[PDB]
Copies of this chain bind each other. A is one copy, B any other.
Amino acid sequence: VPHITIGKVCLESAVELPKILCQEEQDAYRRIHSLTHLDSVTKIHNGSVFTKNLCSQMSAVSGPLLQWLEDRLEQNQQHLQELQQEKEELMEELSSLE
């Protein structure tokens, strides 16, 4: 079914992806940190891994998602301007007839 515009529910659901990925990484890391009986150098290694993982998440997901939302705001601004122009044109065409 063509839903001409994006619903608030679907935007609030689509922005959940980076949050859920970050929560997945955090839960994996918490399960890693749960084993208290652990080397310090291993913890530094795991910290480096966690940093690179979230850097990948931001480079591949959050960044492009935010860029798409900015581009869509530009598209929406242009479309609103054109539709306001068309509304004024139709209002002028119909109003003077009476």
Q: Which residues of A contact B (CB under 8 A)?
A: 39, 41-42, 44-45, 48-49, 51-52, 55-56, 58-59, 63
Contacts and interface: CB of A to CB of B under 8 A. Distances in A.
Interface-central residue, A42, A52, A59, A63, by most chain B CB under 10 Å: A52
A39 B60 CA distance: 13
A interface: dominant SS: helix
A44 B48 contact: no
B52 A45 contact: yes
21 contacts: A39-B59, A41-B55, A41-B58, A41-B59, A41-B63, A42-B55, A42-B59, A44-B51, A44-B55, A45-B51, A45-B52, A45-B55, A45-B56, A45-B59, A48-B48, A48-B49, A48-B51, A48-B52, A48-B55, A49-B52, A52-B52
